[PDB]
Amino acid sequence: RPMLQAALENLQAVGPAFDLDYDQNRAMLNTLNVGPTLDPRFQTYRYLRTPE
Amino acid sequence: QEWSSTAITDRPTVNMLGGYYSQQQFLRNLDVRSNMASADQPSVMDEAYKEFVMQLASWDTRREFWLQTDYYKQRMVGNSKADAALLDEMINNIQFIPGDFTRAVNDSVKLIAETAPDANNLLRQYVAFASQRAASHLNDELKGAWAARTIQMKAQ
Amino acid sequence: QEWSSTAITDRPTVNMLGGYYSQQQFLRNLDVRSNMASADQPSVMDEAYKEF
Amino acid sequence: VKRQEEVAKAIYDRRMNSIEQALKIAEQHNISRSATDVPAEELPDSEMFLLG
Protein backbone atom coordinates (compact mmCIF):
# COMPACT_ATOMS: atom_id res chain seq x y z
CA ARG A 1 0.00 0.00 0.00
CA PRO A 2 2.37 2.86 1.05
CA MET A 3 5.02 2.81 -1.69
CA LEU A 4 2.22 2.38 -4.24
CA GLN A 5 0.89 5.72 -3.01
CA ALA A 6 4.45 7.06 -3.31
CA ALA A 7 4.59 5.94 -6.96
CA LEU A 8 1.47 7.95 -7.78
CA GLU A 9 2.87 11.10 -6.15
CA ASN A 10 6.27 10.88 -7.87
CA LEU A 11 4.95 10.29 -11.40
CA GLN A 12 2.32 13.01 -10.89
CA ALA A 13 4.95 15.67 -10.15
CA VAL A 14 7.24 14.75 -13.07
CA GLY A 15 4.94 14.91 -16.08
CA PRO A 16 5.09 13.27 -19.51
CA ALA A 17 8.36 11.76 -20.72
CA PHE A 18 9.94 13.14 -23.89
CA ASP A 19 12.55 11.58 -26.16
CA LEU A 20 15.54 13.13 -27.93
CA ASP A 21 13.67 13.81 -31.19
CA TYR A 22 11.25 16.15 -29.40
CA ASP A 23 14.10 18.29 -28.03
CA GLN A 24 15.84 18.67 -31.40
CA ASN A 25 12.68 19.99 -33.07
CA ARG A 26 12.20 22.64 -30.37
CA ALA A 27 15.76 23.92 -30.82
CA MET A 28 15.31 24.15 -34.60
CA LEU A 29 11.95 25.91 -34.19
CA ASN A 30 13.65 28.70 -32.22
CA THR A 31 15.83 29.70 -35.19
CA LEU A 32 12.85 29.67 -37.57
CA ASN A 33 10.98 32.05 -35.25
CA VAL A 34 13.72 34.67 -35.68
CA GLY A 35 12.87 35.08 -39.36
CA PRO A 36 14.99 35.59 -42.46
CA THR A 37 17.20 38.61 -43.11
CA LEU A 38 16.52 40.34 -46.43
CA ASP A 39 19.21 42.44 -48.11
CA PRO A 40 18.25 43.98 -51.48
CA ARG A 41 20.49 45.31 -54.27
CA PHE A 42 22.49 42.13 -54.86
CA GLN A 43 23.54 41.38 -58.43
CA THR A 44 21.99 38.52 -60.40
CA TYR A 45 24.30 38.53 -63.45
CA ARG A 46 27.81 39.22 -64.67
CA TYR A 47 29.20 40.91 -67.76
CA LEU A 48 30.93 39.25 -70.70
CA ARG A 49 30.75 42.34 -72.93
CA THR A 50 30.14 45.74 -71.37
CA PRO A 51 28.12 48.20 -73.49
CA GLU A 52 30.20 50.83 -75.25
CA GLN B 1 20.08 58.07 -87.03
CA GLU B 2 19.67 54.62 -85.41
CA TRP B 3 22.81 54.06 -83.39
CA SER B 4 23.21 50.71 -81.64
CA SER B 5 24.72 49.00 -78.60
CA THR B 6 25.17 45.43 -77.40
CA ALA B 7 25.80 43.49 -74.19
CA ILE B 8 26.30 39.85 -73.19
CA THR B 9 25.68 38.35 -69.75
CA ASP B 10 26.16 35.10 -67.82
CA ARG B 11 25.51 33.56 -64.42
CA PRO B 12 26.55 35.42 -61.25
CA THR B 13 29.09 34.28 -58.66
CA VAL B 14 28.74 33.19 -55.05
CA ASN B 15 30.51 36.35 -53.88
CA MET B 16 28.06 38.75 -55.55
CA LEU B 17 24.92 37.00 -54.25
CA GLY B 18 25.44 38.48 -50.78
CA GLY B 19 23.68 36.92 -47.83
CA TYR B 20 20.87 35.50 -49.96
CA TYR B 21 23.01 32.45 -50.78
CA SER B 22 23.34 31.17 -47.20
CA GLN B 23 19.65 31.37 -46.29
CA GLN B 24 18.55 29.62 -49.50
CA GLN B 25 21.03 26.84 -48.70
CA PHE B 26 19.62 26.48 -45.18
CA LEU B 27 16.04 25.97 -46.38
CA ARG B 28 16.99 23.37 -49.00
CA ASN B 29 18.74 21.22 -46.39
CA LEU B 30 15.55 21.09 -44.32
CA ASP B 31 13.86 19.62 -47.40
CA VAL B 32 16.32 16.72 -47.66
CA ARG B 33 16.72 15.45 -44.08
CA SER B 34 12.92 15.49 -43.78
CA ASN B 35 10.04 15.56 -46.32
CA MET B 36 11.89 12.95 -48.46
CA ALA B 37 12.52 15.47 -51.21
CA SER B 38 15.31 16.95 -53.37
CA ALA B 39 17.10 15.52 -56.42
CA ASP B 40 19.86 16.54 -58.83
CA GLN B 41 18.58 20.09 -58.42
CA PRO B 42 20.09 23.10 -60.19
CA SER B 43 22.35 25.24 -58.04
CA VAL B 44 21.25 28.45 -56.33
CA MET B 45 23.13 30.47 -58.95
CA ASP B 46 21.20 28.72 -61.73
CA GLU B 47 17.72 29.60 -60.46
CA ALA B 48 18.71 33.22 -59.77
CA TYR B 49 19.93 33.65 -63.35
CA LYS B 50 16.76 32.06 -64.76
CA GLU B 51 14.67 34.74 -63.04
CA PHE B 52 16.87 37.52 -64.43
CA VAL B 53 16.45 36.36 -68.03
CA MET B 54 12.66 36.30 -67.65
CA GLN B 55 12.55 39.96 -66.59
CA LEU B 56 14.96 41.01 -69.34
CA ALA B 57 12.73 39.81 -72.21
CA SER B 58 9.41 40.82 -70.62
CA TRP B 59 7.12 43.19 -72.49
CA ASP B 60 6.02 44.75 -69.19
CA THR B 61 9.58 45.61 -68.12
CA ARG B 62 10.35 47.54 -71.31
CA ARG B 63 7.12 49.56 -71.10
CA GLU B 64 7.82 50.48 -67.47
CA PHE B 65 11.45 51.47 -68.14
CA TRP B 66 10.63 54.01 -70.86
CA LEU B 67 7.93 55.71 -68.77
CA GLN B 68 10.57 57.10 -66.36
CA THR B 69 13.62 57.41 -68.63
CA ASP B 70 13.60 61.24 -69.06
CA TYR B 71 14.60 60.61 -72.68
CA TYR B 72 10.99 59.91 -73.68
CA LYS B 73 9.43 62.61 -71.49
CA GLN B 74 11.10 65.27 -73.65
CA ARG B 75 9.54 63.86 -76.83
CA MET B 76 5.97 64.30 -75.55
CA VAL B 77 3.79 66.32 -77.93
CA GLY B 78 0.79 66.37 -75.60
CA ASN B 79 -1.74 64.45 -77.68
CA SER B 80 -2.81 61.12 -76.21
CA LYS B 81 -2.80 59.27 -79.54
CA ALA B 82 0.66 60.50 -80.53
CA ASP B 83 2.20 59.58 -77.17
CA ALA B 84 0.80 56.04 -77.30
CA ALA B 85 2.05 55.56 -80.86
CA LEU B 86 5.54 56.80 -79.95
CA LEU B 87 5.78 54.59 -76.86
CA ASP B 88 4.91 51.45 -78.83
CA GLU B 89 7.69 52.14 -81.34
CA MET B 90 10.36 52.61 -78.66
CA ILE B 91 9.38 49.35 -76.94
CA ASN B 92 10.30 47.49 -80.15
CA ASN B 93 13.77 49.11 -80.13
CA ILE B 94 15.02 46.58 -77.55
CA GLN B 95 15.70 43.05 -78.81
CA PHE B 96 16.67 39.95 -76.84
CA ILE B 97 18.35 36.93 -78.43
CA PRO B 98 18.49 33.67 -76.43
CA GLY B 99 21.73 31.72 -76.48
CA ASP B 100 22.53 28.14 -77.46
CA PHE B 101 24.60 25.99 -75.11
CA THR B 102 25.81 23.41 -77.65
CA ARG B 103 27.21 26.07 -80.00
CA ALA B 104 28.68 28.02 -77.04
CA VAL B 105 26.48 31.08 -77.60
CA ASN B 106 25.34 33.28 -74.72
CA ASP B 107 22.34 35.55 -74.30
CA SER B 108 22.61 39.07 -75.71
CA VAL B 109 20.49 42.22 -75.75
CA LYS B 110 20.57 45.11 -78.23
CA LEU B 111 19.29 48.69 -78.04
CA ILE B 112 18.75 51.39 -80.67
CA ALA B 113 18.74 55.14 -79.98
CA GLU B 114 19.25 58.44 -81.79
CA THR B 115 22.70 59.49 -80.53
CA ALA B 116 25.93 57.60 -79.87
CA PRO B 117 26.32 58.74 -76.22
CA ASP B 118 22.66 57.87 -75.61
CA ALA B 119 23.03 54.36 -77.05
CA ASN B 120 25.25 53.05 -74.25
CA ASN B 121 24.00 55.27 -71.42
CA LEU B 122 20.46 53.93 -71.79
CA LEU B 123 21.59 50.31 -72.17
CA ARG B 124 23.56 50.46 -68.91
CA GLN B 125 20.52 51.75 -67.01
CA TYR B 126 18.15 49.16 -68.48
CA VAL B 127 20.26 46.20 -67.36
CA ALA B 128 20.46 47.65 -63.86
CA PHE B 129 16.70 48.26 -63.91
CA ALA B 130 15.93 44.66 -64.87
CA SER B 131 18.32 43.27 -62.25
CA GLN B 132 16.67 45.16 -59.38
CA ARG B 133 13.24 43.78 -60.28
CA ALA B 134 14.57 40.21 -60.28
CA ALA B 135 16.26 40.71 -56.90
CA SER B 136 13.03 41.99 -55.33
CA HIS B 137 11.06 39.06 -56.76
CA LEU B 138 13.51 36.54 -55.28
CA ASN B 139 13.22 38.06 -51.79
CA ASP B 140 9.43 37.60 -51.79
CA GLU B 141 9.86 33.96 -52.81
CA LEU B 142 12.23 33.38 -49.89
CA LYS B 143 9.82 35.01 -47.44
CA GLY B 144 6.90 32.90 -48.66
CA ALA B 145 8.71 29.59 -48.30
CA TRP B 146 10.16 30.60 -44.93
CA ALA B 147 6.70 31.20 -43.45
CA ALA B 148 5.29 28.00 -44.95
CA ARG B 149 8.03 25.90 -43.34
CA THR B 150 7.46 27.54 -39.94
CA ILE B 151 3.76 26.63 -40.02
CA GLN B 152 4.49 23.00 -40.94
CA MET B 153 7.09 22.58 -38.19
CA LYS B 154 4.94 24.30 -35.54
CA ALA B 155 2.11 21.80 -36.12
CA GLN B 156 4.27 18.66 -36.07
CA GLN C 1 -13.64 47.88 -87.11
CA GLU C 2 -11.95 44.70 -85.80
CA TRP C 3 -9.46 45.93 -83.22
CA SER C 4 -7.27 43.52 -81.27
CA SER C 5 -5.25 42.99 -78.10
CA THR C 6 -2.90 40.35 -76.71
CA ALA C 7 -1.68 38.90 -73.42
CA ILE C 8 0.98 36.42 -72.29
CA THR C 9 0.95 34.36 -69.09
CA ASP C 10 3.19 31.99 -67.13
CA ARG C 11 3.17 29.75 -64.06
CA PRO C 12 2.43 31.45 -60.72
CA THR C 13 4.59 31.48 -57.59
CA VAL C 14 4.18 30.37 -53.98
CA ASN C 15 3.05 33.81 -52.85
CA MET C 16 -0.27 34.15 -54.69
CA LEU C 17 -1.19 30.48 -54.23
CA GLY C 18 -2.43 31.46 -50.76
CA GLY C 19 -3.21 28.80 -48.19
CA TYR C 20 -3.89 26.18 -50.85
CA TYR C 21 -0.17 25.42 -51.14
CA SER C 22 0.30 24.26 -47.54
CA GLN C 23 -2.81 22.06 -47.44
CA GLN C 24 -1.88 20.35 -50.71
CA GLN C 25 1.64 19.67 -49.40
CA PHE C 26 0.27 18.06 -46.23
CA LEU C 27 -1.63 15.39 -48.17
CA ARG C 28 1.42 14.51 -50.29
CA ASN C 29 3.45 13.57 -47.21
CA LEU C 30 0.87 10.93 -46.27
CA ASP C 31 1.04 9.71 -49.89
CA VAL C 32 4.83 9.26 -49.36
CA ARG C 33 4.12 7.13 -46.24
CA SER C 34 1.36 5.14 -48.01
CA ASN C 35 0.32 4.19 -51.58
CA MET C 36 3.82 5.00 -52.85
CA ALA C 37 4.02 7.99 -55.18
CA SER C 38 6.68 8.68 -57.79
CA ALA C 39 9.67 10.69 -56.59
CA ASP C 40 9.75 12.98 -59.65
CA GLN C 41 6.19 14.21 -59.22
CA PRO C 42 5.36 17.53 -60.91
CA SER C 43 5.45 20.53 -58.60
CA VAL C 44 2.30 22.02 -57.08
CA MET C 45 2.56 25.20 -59.16
CA ASP C 46 2.97 23.09 -62.30
CA GLU C 47 -0.39 21.36 -61.78
CA ALA C 48 -2.22 24.60 -60.95
CA TYR C 49 -1.00 26.18 -64.19
CA LYS C 50 -2.01 23.10 -66.19
CA GLU C 51 -5.62 23.52 -65.04
CA PHE C 52 -5.67 27.22 -65.94
CA VAL D 1 27.35 23.60 -32.78
CA LYS D 2 25.23 26.24 -31.03
CA ARG D 3 22.08 24.17 -31.52
CA GLN D 4 23.71 21.02 -30.13
CA GLU D 5 24.87 22.92 -27.03
CA GLU D 6 21.38 24.13 -26.09
CA VAL D 7 19.84 20.69 -26.70
CA ALA D 8 22.15 19.04 -24.16
CA LYS D 9 21.46 21.75 -21.57
CA ALA D 10 17.68 21.25 -21.79
CA ILE D 11 18.03 17.53 -21.05
CA TYR D 12 20.42 18.23 -18.17
CA ASP D 13 18.02 20.72 -16.58
CA ARG D 14 15.13 18.25 -16.77
CA ARG D 15 17.17 15.55 -15.01
CA MET D 16 18.06 18.01 -12.24
CA ASN D 17 14.39 18.75 -11.53
CA SER D 18 13.36 15.09 -11.35
CA ILE D 19 16.07 14.25 -8.81
CA GLU D 20 15.02 17.09 -6.49
CA GLN D 21 11.33 16.12 -6.46
CA ALA D 22 12.08 12.46 -5.69
CA LEU D 23 14.20 13.53 -2.70
CA LYS D 24 11.30 15.28 -0.96
CA ILE D 25 8.98 12.29 -1.38
CA ALA D 26 11.55 9.81 -0.06
CA GLU D 27 12.07 11.80 3.14
CA GLN D 28 8.31 12.21 3.66
CA HIS D 29 7.51 8.49 3.41
CA ASN D 30 10.77 7.59 5.22
CA ILE D 31 12.18 5.10 2.71
CA SER D 32 15.91 4.42 3.06
CA ARG D 33 16.43 0.95 1.56
CA SER D 34 17.21 0.18 -2.09
CA ALA D 35 14.05 -1.45 -3.42
CA THR D 36 15.57 -2.17 -6.85
CA ASP D 37 19.11 -3.21 -7.77
CA VAL D 38 18.89 -1.52 -11.20
CA PRO D 39 21.45 1.33 -11.24
CA ALA D 40 20.22 4.91 -11.39
CA GLU D 41 21.93 5.47 -14.76
CA GLU D 42 19.22 3.51 -16.58
CA LEU D 43 16.11 4.41 -14.65
CA PRO D 44 13.09 6.11 -16.23
CA ASP D 45 12.46 9.65 -15.03
CA SER D 46 9.30 8.48 -13.25
CA GLU D 47 10.79 6.05 -10.73
CA MET D 48 13.59 7.54 -8.66
CA PHE D 49 11.50 6.91 -5.53
CA LEU D 50 12.55 3.25 -5.78
CA LEU D 51 15.85 4.23 -4.16
CA GLY D 52 16.94 4.97 -0.63
Author numbering:
A (entry chain E): 261 to 312
B (entry chain E): 53 to 208
C (entry chain B): 53 to 104
D (entry chain D): 209 to 260
The publication says:
Lipopolysaccharides such as the enterobacterial common antigen are important components of the enterobacterial cell envelope that act as a protective barrier against the environment and are often polymerized by the inner membrane bound Wzy-dependent pathway. By employing cryo-electron microscopy we show that WzzE, the co-polymerase component of this pathway that is responsible for the length modulation of the enterobacterial common antigen, is octameric with alternating up-down conformations of its L4 loops. The alternating up-down nature of these essential loops, located at the top of the periplasmic bell, are modulated by clashing helical faces between adjacent protomers that flank the L4 loops around the octameric periplasmic bell. This alternating arrangement and a highly negatively charged binding face create a dynamic environment in which the polysaccharide chain is extended, and suggest a ratchet-type mechanism for polysaccharide elongation.
The ConSurf analysis also revealed an arginine within α7 (R267) that interacts with the downward facing L4 to be highly conserved. To investigate how robust the alternating conformation of the L4 loops is, we replaced this residue with an alanine and a glutamic acid in two constructs. Although the change of this amino acid is clearly visible in the cryo-EM density map, replacement had little effect on the overall octameric structure of WzzE or the alternating arrangement of the L4 loops. The R267A variant did, however, have a small, but noticeable 2 Å shift upwards of the entire L4 region suggesting that this conserved residue could somehow help stabilize this otherwise dynamic region of the complex. Although there are only small differences between the native WzzE and both R267 variants, these variants do underscore the nature of the alternating loops in WzzE, as both structures of the mutants were solved independently using reference-free ab-initio starting volumes and clearly display the same pattern of alternating L4 loops in their unsymmetrized C1 maps as the native WzzE.
